[PDB]
């Protein structure tokens, strides 16, 4: 594919799941990809194996550790991208956590780590990438991976849903601030995205059937289901799209019981 | 080549967004049915687009089918099936916005706006969706709605409910038609420079005022909707249904 | 005296579809708040009987009301209701548009006649009832309030409601556009969005105790709504408590919309 | 008598919307905890409000409790319980909007905005809700958010996410606290003339431009939010939770 030929794409949280699938598809569309990961041993291992898979089909990618909760990570990722590839053209902000926990006994540290990682870290990663895009003067695209939970509630996600709605709101306000520099800012809202079914347990499979019944398309999402929408929003197919959000949920949001 | 071997029906495709979407689908490999109003101007515009498409190697036919006539849906599907053997994508785009104040709104003006923009769309969607279910191969439906689906307009009290109604139709059809692999979504164009508003935008002081409200710094053009429509019609959007997508250069978020 | 409120004292309120359900409860509470109420009904035998029994109850607790038959699908009904209100009470100050139908039906075999009756009753008839009321409010020069009773279905889909959800979304959009058009005349326009409300309509879905238990378990507040649960929000939007509220919508659903499952 | 004998905690109540909401709660029979920042101006405003309320026969106390200090929620609850025996309503209103461009936003300013507007709200809601659950009599929580929860602002990249986050917090808390009869809702004020925007509103030309964008034809006053807040706090809203209410004179829908 050639939707992102000669663009440098940073993807945060890209060692597994949606970010992994997005980074891969960006590389398949001709981009040179900075695979950001958490800096953990599993994160590094997944980032490097993705880099290998990309190298195998002729792509170009590097892996960069950068804990999203560390607010210095944005400039570290931009610096690594500019050092290796000379530019930053697309940011896919995807790193996040969702430690389910009840509201009335939520500890401060868990709440603050969730906001810190999902929203504050995103803020300054977007800021670092957008600064570089403005300095280049060639435009850019920023995509925040948020969630259907940006639009509705979850009882075990009182600390989590505000960060997802926060991300949507950040893209709306950045769209105004960065529009004069040709930088488009949008959000994708994944619904229920499943992990590999061959690795699930029997109990995990029984919950899969109930959640699947809730989706009009008749199946849970896969990480690759988010790659097309992310690459669309990063590309010239979306040349007039900014300040927008896009549900990628198989109809889950509209399917009121 | 996102739509190779797909039959695409575009309603109201002789001018504006519909014309650009029909041409782009054809460039992506689709066989395109160019639906128009049946008027003399509609027929001429659809004819010229069909010739343009044929000139770059694409395939298209032109079909008159007044969107206000509830028989038009089956006529378009029958023409598509006769010419190309299938219906795989519907881009519902025919619509009118006769600006008029609310307190003196004529009943027949209101009824023609709802009849064209919403009622005609309902039964065009129904006719295409039936064929798609019958084929058993899935499909995609894209309603061209508007930013006006989300906010108000004092001279559009008859019009904004049809745009919001179209979005809602896509949400409910996504549920009804999801088990058949038929995805239903809406695009919400912002301020698009077309033939309808060309005289209003001739006022270049007005144009600069309208332009200053768009963060991307320009008004839209019909090709700005072509990419998002083809995306929603394609396998890039295989898990997208019941969704809406603003295509407005940031207009909606830019609270003045 | 009956511990009547005064939020709507000296105001004339037209309620369409007021013989039963949400409309009946709204009309009753407006009268408890001091309003003179036009109890609009469909003209059917059942509608007329329900409107008369409400008028008897209101009269007995010291309120003021009249019953007026006015089929919402007849686009002349808006002017009929306004004329009755002006003749009986001298003004029109609040419109609560509540008349509507939801004949559940699948999409692919939806008949034209059923679809067109649903749009005609729920949206077209509301449009010209709002128009007739708003013209009288403008002519009076004392402002007013319009409340459309829409539905949570204005925000989400329903497979057996492809003909119905667009009319509910359309009503919300109508309030947004009318808020702009009528704001200069002091007329505020808002929509209320009820969730699952146990009314006579969904009598037979709720007849199934197992279905009813599942529907109740989806509401965070833990119960289905009652028509009286909509009376307070409607009266609020009609009153000076909401003097700066226009172009707005209000979910009244016990948390159903936010409770993603 | 919408709130007779209820204990209402209002944060940020020395001025503006919070001050008017605290006053109206007391006019409805509530005993009011006037939360303020602890600054000299916060202390003076809270005292004058407490005296205002006392002068018309109400009951109130003032409590300094910086919303950025995450201990403040339990400080307010403890003061409410000692003075008045219960907590029944929380109006979360404390917030800041230090306008600043995005690309040079300092970390300290961003973190103080999130910390005050969202993090402090979270743990104030948590403290109030714990006490409401222990009492077993239900309760009401109202977050004062903004129209900016729905749209963007170039000089508010740090601010609008906190306002949208407040709305989302009420949505999730409505689910978690529903079983305990605790309703959670947000109000979204439009352009409200307060001490914050006071200097910008002395420019007569700009005030006219901002007024012309409101369909009701005037800017809001703090009293304009009091009615909606007391409504959401009361039995008039007994089936309302997880909901949001624009209080903006039509500003949001009035697309240019």
Swiss-Prot record, chain A:
Gene3D superfamilies: NAD(P)-binding Rossmann-like Domain (3.40.50.720). GO terms for molecular function: nucleotide binding; oxidoreductase activity, acting on the CH-OH group of donors, NAD or NADP as acceptor; quinone binding. Pathway: Carbohydrate degradation; L-rhamnose degradation. Changing residue 38 to H: Increases specificity toward NAD(+). Shows a strong decrease in catalytic efficiency with NADP(+) and an increase in catalytic efficiency with NAD(+). Pfam families: adh_short_C2. Beta-L-rhamnose binds at residues 147, 149, 157, 160, 192, 198. Its EC number is 1.1.1.378. The keyword Nucleotide-binding applies. Keywords: NAD, NADP, Nucleotide-binding, Oxidoreductase, Rhamnose metabolism. This is L-rhamnose 1-dehydrogenase (NAD(P)(+)). InterPro entries: NAD(P)-bd_dom_sf, SDR_fam. NADP(+) binds at residues 13, 15-16, 18, 38, 67-68, 94, 160, 164, 193. It comes from the Bacteria. The active site is at residues 147, 160, 164. It catalyses: L-rhamnofuranose + NAD(+) = L-rhamnono-1,4-lactone + NADH + H(+); L-rhamnofuranose + NADP(+) = L-rhamnono-1,4-lactone + NADPH + H(+). Changing residue 197 to A: Shows a strong decrease in catalytic efficiency with L-rhamnose as substrate, but does not affect catalytic efficiency with L-lyxose and L-mannose. SMART domains: PKS_KR. It comes from Azotobacter vinelandii (strain DJ / ATCC BAA-1303). One of its GO terms (biological process) is fatty acid biosynthetic process. Belongs to the short-chain dehydrogenases/reductases (SDR) family. NAD(P)-dependent dehydrogenase that catalyzes the oxidation of L-rhamnose to L-rhamnono-1,4-lactone. Also shows high activity with L-lyxose and low activity with L-mannose and L-fucose. Can utilize either NAD(+) or NADP(+), with a strong preference for NADP(+). Catalyzes the first step in an alternative pathway for rhamnose utilization that does not involve phosphorylated intermediates.
């Amino acid at each position: 594919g050639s939707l992102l030929i000669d663009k440098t794409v940073i993807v945060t949280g890209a060692s597994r799941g949606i970010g992994r699938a997005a980074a891969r598809e960006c590389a398949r569309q001709g981009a040179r990809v900075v695979i950001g990961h958490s800096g953990s041993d599993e994160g590094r291992a997944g980032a490097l194996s993705l880099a290998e898979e990309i190298a195998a089909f002729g792509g170009t990618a590097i892996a960069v550790g950068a804990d999203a909760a560390d607010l210095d990570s944005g400039e570290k990722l931009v610096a690594a991208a500019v050092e290796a590839f000379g530019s930053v053209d697309v940011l896919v902000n995807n790193a996040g956590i969702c430690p389910f926990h009840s509201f009335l006994d939520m500890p401060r540290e868990l709440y603050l780590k969730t906001v810190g990682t999902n929203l504050n870290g995103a803020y300054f990663t977007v800021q670092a990438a957008a600064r570089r895009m403005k300095e280049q003067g060639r435009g850019g695209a920023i995509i925040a991976v948020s969630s259907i939970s940006a639009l509705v509630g979850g009882a075990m996600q009182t600390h989590y849903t505000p960060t997802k709605a926060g991300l949507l709101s950040l893209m709306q306000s950045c769209a105004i601030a960065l529009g004069p520099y040709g930088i488009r800012c949008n959000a994708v809202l994944p619904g229920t995205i499943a992990t590999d079914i061959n690795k699930e347990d029997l109990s995990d499979l029984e919950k899969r059937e109930r959640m699947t019944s809730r989706v009009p398309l008749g199946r849970l999402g896969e990480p690759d289901d988010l790659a097309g929408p992310i690459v669309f929003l990063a590309s010239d197919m979306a040349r007039y799209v900014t300040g927008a959000s896009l549900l990628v949920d198989g109809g889950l949001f509209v399917n009121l019981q």
